[PDB]
Design a protein around this ligand. Structure first.
Ligand SMILES: Nc1ncnc2c1ncn2[C@@H]1O[C@H](COP(=O)(O)OP(=O)(O)OP(=O)(O)O)[C@@H](O)[C@H]1O
Ligand SMILES: Nc1ncnc2c1ncn2[C@@H]1O[C@H](COP(=O)(O)OP(=O)(O)O)[C@@H](O)[C@H]1O
Ligand SMILES: [Mg+2]
Ligand SMILES: [Mg+2]
Lengths: 78, 229, 246, 236
């Protein structure tokens, strides 16, 4: 999960959302402020570990949860 | 049809005789001892390891192990002649068994396999490594496409080790299955392996990705028209 | 309604299935086989108890039916063994009652195994054979344990059976033994009180040991002494054999 | 140069490779008889012979020499011990040669010869263990025995492959190096059953679980008889 967090943070710091730039600078600042929560255990990993025993409708997969999270954070930067 | 064919029941092949004669033909001073230690070893691993759907320890696996053992013995002989006579044949078989069985094993079965190896071959040991150029190219590609690289005990250590095991399987094998739960790094693993092999050996890599269940079998292999052949 | 009767039998069922201890660092082959077998038995027990509790809640209580629960209830009412629980060999499709009885006996045996392991002492525990998930693995672990204990070769060990680890639940078929001497009998099956499995490096009638009456799953092979007037060809023609469960 | 039709000159090529393999096998088995008349053999001239002939030809010539020698011994236990000692010293020189470093093609030929000579050694040891006097005993008739007749007017019909009540002719198809199979007793039983079925002009249907040796034993029998074996992967 920290590997996936590192991939998301790297792809946020580089490759700006528009297909240096002000948007890239905003992405870098957002990654800098979200780094402490993603790194180590932090909020996200403990949240996942608790949410695995909560009952869901569809079977829960950590990559589905993190894909939702990453898309929502890209929307926050936008 | 049944009266037009003569049936023979093949269920139990002499694995011990097969291994002994084949190791003797490959060239091994202790061929009989190696066979008598390698066939009951596969029998032991058949039961005492955990039961999985992707596990197999049959005659195909045994023959793959023996052929790879002959190949690595020949390459070690070439290396020593570069730098013969008495050679660690038990270490050669251990290297072949590890290189062929270890990637297949679940994480809870590697200590069991190594305990069985220490039981059968006392002076066995192991030697894994010496892939520095491929490791450096893997690190370069992983840094290129926003992936994390590990040294074995770092964060990406298990993933990089599995990539190297995949490379070994591609080298000494014919067809491959990357079995794992959804989100285990299989696609990234083989993609960075293909790119790193392209960077090392210069030969361009082409990958065709086919989903066999998104199309019918007739669209996957082909059809014969019933009217005209 | 069939639901009330199903709920009554359903409440009757799990009184023979309560809990299993999961029991873990030893290189003994016997302990290794026993720990993998007890972990798979604990997983099976948890699955079965969860299924039974789910059907109890859905029938004698308030719970919406799912597709899995509908399939399970249909299989339970039909009386066929559900495929979700058949994780070991069952003789020719036994009924749910027989399967539950056999499973409860196996769980009692595993509880005894866990008690003995907690107290190694696993060398001298008298252990059955039909109640094990994989008796072939038990015999292989037997051979490995004796080979490691005496420190000679595993591939050159013969088996001598005297009526050394205690195996119970075995039953002959068509013959009986009188002081390690087989005798032809007209009885269907004669029980075996005590069997020990000694290992020696190097007219004897050799017999199969099947898993059940189906004679489809051969486990291992025993050797016995013949009576003075009987014949090994007569034994082979009559098809005398040993079963792990009868 | 005359430029016939492509199928015509391909048919000529096929017939030419068949007669070429027949002539090469004839001169090869002459060389093997010359070599194996003596007890001790020279590794240098043996290795030159290995490099001289093709892989299927050297394997089959060794088979012919062993079969003829053991049949001569059975016709007449001293000569049977002599042929066992000859097989054993051939195993010794083969083992020395494979322990020494060889080019890959020679190494493959040596591996095939070692497998075949191990099978011959085991059969001759069993034939010693049983008390066999005459050559008509079924304990010898069961084995696959090879007969070479140099007086045959046809080069393609010079070799006759025999089993227990089964006469076969070598197809003389160029097979490459292939891969010899370790002669399991199960493989010998398969050879007996399949040759009985072929003598009865039936088919052959080995069956069993996967990874047992069915397809490979069928292909090995086909390559032993020198036929072109095509494996078809059937489906619906
Ligand atoms: N070394 C790595 N470092 C960082 N992130 C990684 C690494 N390897 C994989 N990932 C991330 O893991 C995600 C999972 O995708 P991946 O292609 O690895 O899945 P998979 O194993 O092929 O799964 P599936 O069976 O669902 O196809 C990728 O999108 C990527 O972001
Ligand atoms: N007598 C033998 N000697 C050497 N190898 C053998 C022998 N019999 C089987 N094998 C090996 O065992 C494997 C079995 O595969 P195969 O026989 O093709 O599968 P199947 O017959 O079940 O379709 C093959 O790789 C083959 O090389
Ligand atoms: Mg993928
Ligand atoms: Mg096949």
């Amino acid at each position: 999960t920290d590997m996936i967090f590192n991939n998301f943070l790297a792809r946020l710091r580089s490759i700006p959302l528009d297909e240096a730039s002000p948007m890239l600078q905003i992405q870098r600042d957002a990654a800098t402020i979200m780094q402490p929560y993603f790194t180590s255990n932090g909020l996200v990993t403990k949240a996942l570990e608790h949410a695995f025993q909560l009952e869901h409708i569809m079977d829960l997969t950590r990559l589905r949860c993190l894909g939702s999270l990453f898309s929502m954070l890209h929307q926050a930067c936008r | 049809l049944k009266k037009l064919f003569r049936s023979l029941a093949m269920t139990k092949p002499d694995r011990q005789l097969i291994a002994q004669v084949m190791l003797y033909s490959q060239g091994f001073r202790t061929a009989e001892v190696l066979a008598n230690k390698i066939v009951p070893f596969f029998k032991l691993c058949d039961e005492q390891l955990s039961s999985q759907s992707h596990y197999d320890f049959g005659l195909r696996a045994l023959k793959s192990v023996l052929v790879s053992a002959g190949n690595v013995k020949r390459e070690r002989i070439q290396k020593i002649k570069r730098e013969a006579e008495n050679l660690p044949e038990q270490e050669i078989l251990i290297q072949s068994v590890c290189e062929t069985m270890v990637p297949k094993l679940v994480a809870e079965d590697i200590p069991l396999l190594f305990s069985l190896l220490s039981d059968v071959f006392p002076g066995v040991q192991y030697h894994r490594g010496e892939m520095t150029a491929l490791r450096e190219e893997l690190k370069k590609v992983c840094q290129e496409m926003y992936l994390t690289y590990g040294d074995g005990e770092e964060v990406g250590g298990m993933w990089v080790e599995k990539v190297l095991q995949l490379y070994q399987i591609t080298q000494i094998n014919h067809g491959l299955m990357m079995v794992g739960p959804s989100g285990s790094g299989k696609s990234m693993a083989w993609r960075v392996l293909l790119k790193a092999l392209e960077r090392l050996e210069g030969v361009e890599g082409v990958a065709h990705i086919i989903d066999p269940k998104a199309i019918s079998k007739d669209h996957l292999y082909g059809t014969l028209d019933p009217n005209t052949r | 309604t069939l639901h009330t009767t199903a709920s009554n039998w359903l409440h009757l069922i799990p009184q023979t299935l309560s809990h299993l201890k999961r029991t873990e660092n030893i290189k003994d082959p016997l302990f290794r086989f026993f720990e993998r077998e007890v972990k798979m038995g604990a997983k099976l027990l948890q699955d079965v108890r969860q299924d039974l509790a789910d059907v109890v809640q859905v029938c004698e209580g308030k719970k919406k039916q799912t597709n899995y629960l509908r399939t399970l209830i249909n299989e339970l009412v039909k009386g066929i063994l559900p495929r979700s629980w058949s994780h070991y060999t069952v003789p020719a499709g036994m009924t749910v009652i027989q399967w539950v009885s056999d499973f409860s006996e196996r769980i009692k045996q595993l509880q005894n195994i866990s008690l003995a392991a907690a107290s190694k002492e696993l060398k001298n525990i008298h252990v059955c054979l039909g109640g094990l998930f994989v008796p072939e693995a038990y015999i292989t672990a037997t051979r490995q344990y004796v080979a490691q204990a005496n420190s000679w070769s595993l591939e050159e060990l013969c088996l001598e059976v005297n009526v050394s680890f205690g195996v119970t639940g075995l039953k002959l078929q068509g013959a009986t033994c009188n002081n390690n001497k087989l005798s032809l009998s007209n009885a269907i099956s004669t029980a075996l009180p005590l069997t020990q499995l000694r290992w020696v490096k190097q007219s004897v009638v050799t017999l199969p040991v099947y898993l059940n009456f189906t004679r489809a799953d051969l486990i291992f092979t025993v050797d016995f002494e013949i009576a003075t007037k009987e014949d090994p060809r007569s034994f082979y023609e009559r098809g005398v054999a040993v079963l792990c469960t009868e | 140069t005359e430029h016939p039709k492509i199928n015509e000159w391909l048919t000529l090529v096929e017939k030419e490779m068949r007669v070429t393999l027949a002539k090469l096998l004839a001169e090869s088995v002459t060389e093997v008889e010359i070599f194996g008349k003596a007890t001790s053999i020279d590794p240098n001239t043996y290795i030159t012979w290995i490099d001289k002939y093709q892989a299927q030809l050297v394997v089959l010539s060794a088979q012919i020499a062993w079969s003829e020698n053991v049949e001569t011994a059975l016709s007449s236990a001293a000569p049977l011990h002599s042929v066992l000692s000859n097989v054993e010293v051939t195993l010794n020189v083969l083992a020395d040669s494979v322990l020494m470093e060889q080019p890959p093609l020679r190494r493959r030929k040596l591996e095939h010869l070692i497998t075949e000579l191990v099978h011959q050694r085991d059969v001759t040891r069993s034939l010693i263990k049983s008390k066999i006097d005459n050559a008509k005993s079924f304990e010898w008739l069961s084995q696959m025995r090879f007969y070479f007749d140099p007086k045959q007017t046809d080069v393609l019909q010079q070799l006759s492959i025999q089993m227990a009540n089964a006469k076969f002719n070598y197809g003389f198809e160029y097979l490459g190096v292939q891969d010899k199979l370790v002669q399991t007793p199960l493989t010998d039983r398969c050879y007996l059953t399949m040759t009985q079925a072929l003598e009865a002009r039936l088919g052959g249907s080995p069956f069993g679980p996967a990874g047992t040796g069915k397809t490979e034993s069928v292909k090995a029998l086909g390559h032993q008889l020198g036929r072109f074996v095509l494996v078809f992967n059937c489906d619906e």
